[PDB]
Amino acid sequence: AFVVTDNCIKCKYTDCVEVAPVDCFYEGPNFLVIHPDECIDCALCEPECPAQAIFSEDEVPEDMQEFIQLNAELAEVWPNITEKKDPLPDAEDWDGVKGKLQHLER
Ligand code: SF4
Ligand code: F3S
């Protein structure tokens, strides 16, 4: 499984979903997650993300380990996203800001 980490929050560029072969992505208000069971580990999404938020499970940063579990339980409750959409409004202002999980919206 691949995993969406902190930088996606409040950016949500949704470029990653345009390459997904299966329905691996689940949309939140200001964040996306990857269903670990859907994910075929194709790895196409990871280069697409402008926020560089996506990592292979095996490679999630130490400080971002909570996101492995977070994507797994949030994907059981959010709707599937299959189509790209515009980024959120302050997306470039929020790109690269750290600590954004404090801003996560369910
Ligand atoms: S690695 Fe492929 S299957 Fe997994 S989330 Fe990315 S696009 Fe989807
Ligand atoms: S910012 Fe988030 S919506 Fe996709 S393109 Fe990156 S993981």
Sign of the CA dihedral with 68 first, then 72, 79, and 100 last: negative
Q: Please, where are the H alpha helices in 1-106?
A: 45-48, 66-75, 91-94
Q: Does ligand 2 lie within 6 Å of residue 51's CB atom?
A: yes
**CA 37 to centroid of chain Cα atoms:** 15
Question: Looking at the CA of 45, which ligand is closest?
Answer: 1
Alpha-carbon gap, residue 10 to 62, rounded angstroms: 21
Q: Which ligand is nearest to the CA of 42?
A: 1
Other C-beta atoms closer than 10 Å to the C-beta of 7 total 22
Q: Are 46 and 56 in contact (CB under 8 A)?
A: yes
Tell me the CATH number for domain 1-106.
3.30.70.20
Documented resolution in Å:
1.9
CA distances from 15 to 39, 54, 66, 86, 106 (A): 16, 11, 23, 9, 21
3-state secondary structure (DSSP) of residue 7 = helix
d(CA 96, CA 45): 18
Distance CA 91, CA 11 (A): 4
